[PDB]
Design a protein around this nucleic acid. Sequence first.
RNA 1: UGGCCCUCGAGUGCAAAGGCAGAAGGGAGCUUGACUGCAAGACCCACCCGUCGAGCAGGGACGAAAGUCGGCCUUAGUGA
RNA 2: UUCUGGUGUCCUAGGCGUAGAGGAACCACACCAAUCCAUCCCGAACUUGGUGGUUAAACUCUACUGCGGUGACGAUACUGUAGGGGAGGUCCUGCGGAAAAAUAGCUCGACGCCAGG
Lengths: 61, 134, 51, 64, 120, 175
Amino acid sequence: TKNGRDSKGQRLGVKIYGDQVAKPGAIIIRQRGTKFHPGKNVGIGKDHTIFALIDGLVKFE
Amino acid sequence: LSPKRTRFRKQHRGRMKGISYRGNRICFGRYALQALEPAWITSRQIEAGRRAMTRNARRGGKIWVRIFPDKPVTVRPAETRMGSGKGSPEYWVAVVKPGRILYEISGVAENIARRAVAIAASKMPIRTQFIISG
Amino acid sequence: VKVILECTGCVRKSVNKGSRGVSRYITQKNRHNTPSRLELRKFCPYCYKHT
Amino acid sequence: KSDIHPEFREDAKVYCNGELVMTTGGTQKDYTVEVWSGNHPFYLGNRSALLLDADQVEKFRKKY
Amino acid sequence: HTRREDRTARHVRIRKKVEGTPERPRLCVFRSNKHLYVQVIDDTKMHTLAAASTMQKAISENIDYSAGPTVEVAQKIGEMIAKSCLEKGITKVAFDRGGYPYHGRVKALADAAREHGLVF
Amino acid sequence: RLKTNYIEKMVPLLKEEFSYSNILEVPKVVKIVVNCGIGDASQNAKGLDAAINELALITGQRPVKTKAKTSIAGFKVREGMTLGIAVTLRGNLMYSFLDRLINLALPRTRDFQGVNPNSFDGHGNYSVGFREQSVFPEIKPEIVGKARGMDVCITTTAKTDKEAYKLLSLMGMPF
RNA sequence: UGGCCCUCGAGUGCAAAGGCAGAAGGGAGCUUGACUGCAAGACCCACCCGUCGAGCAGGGACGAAAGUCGGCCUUAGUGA
RNA sequence: UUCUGGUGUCCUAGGCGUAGAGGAACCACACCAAUCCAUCCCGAACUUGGUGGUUAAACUCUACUGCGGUGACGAUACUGUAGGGGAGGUCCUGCGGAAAAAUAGCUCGACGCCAGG
């Protein structure tokens, strides 16, 4: 008699923040849609997640 | 009184905060009823104060009801207390914080607006005063 | 109706390098029969994988 | 494009009933044409109709 | 809406897919009504490597009375852009069409760029 | 042949009537476009064939059955249905069919109104429309018993208060 | 159907959110990668699970090429 | 060695509008025809081959803050800690951080490569 209690538990978010050392294949951003577009030395995923291609820092502009 | 369309049927509460710096000024009218006390004012006290100062002016001038409720308060029935099933068509509620102008009036002289605004402040759960358009 | 159904090649029971029948899961066929060109069979180039 | 479009002929003979012929380009070769706009009664048709036909008094005096 | 904005929008549409790399430069063309232009540029250092134009071949073979871009001067400027970057260290290149659709003189311009052994 | 009559006499008096300073700023007719507003052509298959053969002999080229922009309830309209059969002719065919509106529509109309100073007046780019002459005299007319729609929209380049009305006035459009 | 104005308010098989304007929205051509054998490294992390993935070989699809394709704009559509 | 014009990249994102200028060269429209090509119709778009005149449209340059974008300082709300008042709603102090909106302003982009004259 309530019509509720339908939680989801799903999680996302920024995994590696800026000025941080990345790895080849390290998932930088898990995101819904594209809050963060793929720049250079990265790749976009099948569900629009952003992974790093090479080693080094990450930046935002 | 009551909004015609509701974007959401039931809406939970929210706590009072400091002096409302926006709605403190006087837009229309010469005299006003500024509230010093943060609480809720239903549409029922607004009908009471509106009939009070309209029938206390009663010859000329026009009043200005500033606030509109825009949020409901769901009162659960006496059914042994566990759920918030249906309380949405029950009484509506306006949030008022200090500083905020509740009523205004124009076209009225000095003490007729003092008794008009001051008598209609007795229909109200929060202490107020009347303010001139400075 | 969305019947699940297998595509299949041409059988060729032989003594080649692992030569055997190749069936593949596919769906949606409530229509005319659709042989698609699913490939990399046991014989490496292939076309018209039937049913 | 070929194979779909109708034959747009250049030699289209526009023949008038008042012995005048002019050349236009179109579908048919011959066009037998009535009241066409040069020497049409659009200057005299509005002169004869709506401008002169209305009478009630001079019709009355022609019978007495 | 206009033709020039259509060409620029097509060129920005092409530029998303093809990129100049330090291994493979990109050569873009511009078929203006008097002259062609061709630019072997490198995007990762933002500078040209080997540019030619109708104002390069036009010393010998041109007619300014005619419509300047023809298929023959596209053959000739694809010839000289094919032999101008070959003497520099540019073999493997990434050709784009310059916002113009490929069925035209950029056929013989691209194949003329292929004529001197460029890895296309 | 009226394009040669368009070149030398009615362009320079628009050049000096508006008091321009250059030649190409003088406007010109750009394109005309005919549509045949039909609400029932999937059912009336020989009416759509009548649009193809008969309306392709009305205009210069074959007309195009127009797929539906949207589906409105109440009517028999779905997403992608034939709602009118249109054609866009342009070039010397444009002069040939404004010529056929001078010849086939101006003296052969039962009404005598012509171009109207109270219609097609104000536009961003000035367009002139007519709802007239559902069959041209090239087609045997008594077969089609339905007064099918037909609109011929003329387009111009001008953005003024005078020039399109004088443009049709200098051609064979009195009123 | 024609023209101007606002420029993302439309749309995405369906609920909402985040996205997406020369598009991830609409159309056309050719199509079957809605493959096989895999896989460095990550996220999530009681376990079970679940998600992404550069890169390699075979054999291909489109394109002139560059390149892209291991299903669908994504998150639901399932069961050890 | 400035302009011209293909090209980008950083971007405070540099746009609308009102004004003035450019056809030596360059870029762009316009006229003629269609062989490859093409539009669910139109050489409108795209392609080829030429007459080749104009700046009319479109690009480029220089001004304006009328819109637009951006945007202060000081204040002030808020807040982290350490506390206090009120019956409650909730408020006030010491130190630290510090808004938003509005306003004064700023902005009609800035750096490089290559081919003419």
